């Protein structure tokens, strides 16, 4: 017998019928952050590479932009993910389902690109060459530029950090909000932790032009 009376609930504020407008959008973004960081810890081997929270007014559509859909047998893994959500967030079984898409631009995604280095580093590939192969895929994938930073105990007990750059990249301004794609990953080693920060400078395909540009045509 336990003298415990408190009962922490298993729900989410995006299901409440009555809520303020200030609280709704805060709860809408709070749910995504917990959810996005959740299946990231699960689909890291599958390269989750993004989530979406599209809604059709009543039904909840969850979209996973995974870069490798080989694992997802008649949706057995997909079905298991739904079961966790029902127990955690208290979603009705008829009002939530999971969709998966395969991203065509594999290199352009920094979230899945940083997992390549995290995998290779744990395998024992040299950090100088592991990034070089990874950086090769990003450059020809239509990316204007990228920067990969590795910091930790790469060489010895003393901490060292190398920064690898390629292509054009604007470092300051508001335009960097509409052109950057970044991800932060850390891999446990036998001596400590290696911190991998991967960011990618995009192009005009994510519609929006750079700040300074004239591009005068001819007659």
């Amino acid at each position: 017998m336990f003298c415990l009376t408190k009962t922490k609930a298993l729900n989410v504020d995006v299901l409440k019928t009555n809520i303020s407008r200030k609280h709704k959008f805060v709860a809408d973004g709070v749910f995504y952050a917990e959810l996005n960081e959740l299946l990231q810890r699960e689909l890291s081997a599958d390269g989750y590479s993004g989530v979406e929270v599209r809604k059709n007014g009543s039904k909840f559509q969850i979209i996973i932009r995974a870069t490798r859909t080989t694992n997802i047998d008649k949706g057995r893994r997909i079905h298991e993910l739904t079961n966790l959500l029902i127990a955690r967030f208290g979603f009705p079984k008829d009002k939530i389902e999971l969709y998966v898409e395969k991203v065509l631009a594999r290199g352009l995604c920094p979230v899945s690109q940083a997992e390549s280095i995290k995998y290779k580093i744990a395998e024992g590939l040299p950090v100088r060459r592991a990034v070089g192969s990874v950086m090769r895929l990003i450059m020809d994938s239509g990316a204007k530029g990228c920067e990969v930073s590795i910091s930790g105990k790469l060489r010895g007990q003393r901490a060292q950090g190398m920064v690898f750059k390629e292509g054009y990249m604007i470092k300051s301004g508001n335009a960097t909000r509409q052109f950057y794609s970044s991800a932060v990953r850390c891999v446990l080693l036998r001596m400590g932790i290696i911190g991998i920060k991967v960011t990618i400078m995009l192009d005009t395909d994510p519609s929006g032009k750079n700040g300074p540009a004239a591009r005068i045509p001819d007659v």
């Binding site: 017998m1 336990f2 003298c3 415990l4 408190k6 805060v26 973004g29 952050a33 996005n36």
Partner: protein, 55 residues
């Protein structure tokens, strides 16, 4: 009882009854807008949630 006295103190007002959603810290909490996320953790996911450093 071996566990009847375990956690028998009532915590319903809240300094040790409220925790951060992920970090679990008891200090620096931000209960505004029902965030329930203490600092050093809200800043990590501020842009993720939807907050942007405008003026």
């Amino acid at each position: 009882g071996s566990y009847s006295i375990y956690n028998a103190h009532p915590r319903n007002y809240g300094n040790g009854s409220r925790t951060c959603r992920k970090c679990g810290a008891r200090k620096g909490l931000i209960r505004k807008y029902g965030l329930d996320l203490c600092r050093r953790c809200f800043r990590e996911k501020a842009v993720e949630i939807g907050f942007q450093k405008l003026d």
